[PDB]
Amino acid sequence: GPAQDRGVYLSLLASLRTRAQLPVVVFTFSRGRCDEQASGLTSLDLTTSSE
RNA sequence: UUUUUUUUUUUUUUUUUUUUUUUUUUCUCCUCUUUUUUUUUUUU
């Protein structure tokens, strides 16, 4: 769902940032919805202030 | 629920020269009448 796919995004991005496999590549099969994925999350902040 | 790839505005430059206005034709050709020729001279 529109609000449930975000749940999937914040589920996979939760049980993987704790462990060492934080670098992740998502092979989206559409040039259009690829930007839609990043647009509707808006909060990961996976960067240190030094980086 | 629609991915991936398909180049672009020709290369060249560090060659010598010791002439001179013009330019080139036109043929022989019946002159009508008072004359010898007047004359010094002086006032500029």
How long is the CA A39 to C1' B8 vector, in angstroms?
39
With b for 16 or more beta-carbon neighbours within 10 A and e for fewer, the A2-28 pattern comes to eeeeeeebeeeeeeeeeeeeeeeeeee
Q: Which residues contact A48 (CB under 8 A, 6 or more apart)?
A: none
Instruction: Compute the residue count for chain A.
Output: 51
Identify each DSSP E strand in chain A by its residue range. none
Q: Which residues contact A13 (CB under 8 A, 6 or more apart)?
A: A24, A44
Amino acid (one-letter) located at A44: L
Resolution for this experimental structure (Å): 3.7
User: Are residues A45 and A17 in contact, defined by beta-carbon separation less than 8 angstroms?
Assistant: no
User: Are residues A22 and A50 in contact, defined by beta-carbon separation less than 8 angstroms?
Assistant: no
Closest nucleotide over all strands to A30 (CA to C1'): B3
Bases on strand B under 7 Å from any protein CB: 1-4
How was this structure obtained? cryo-EM
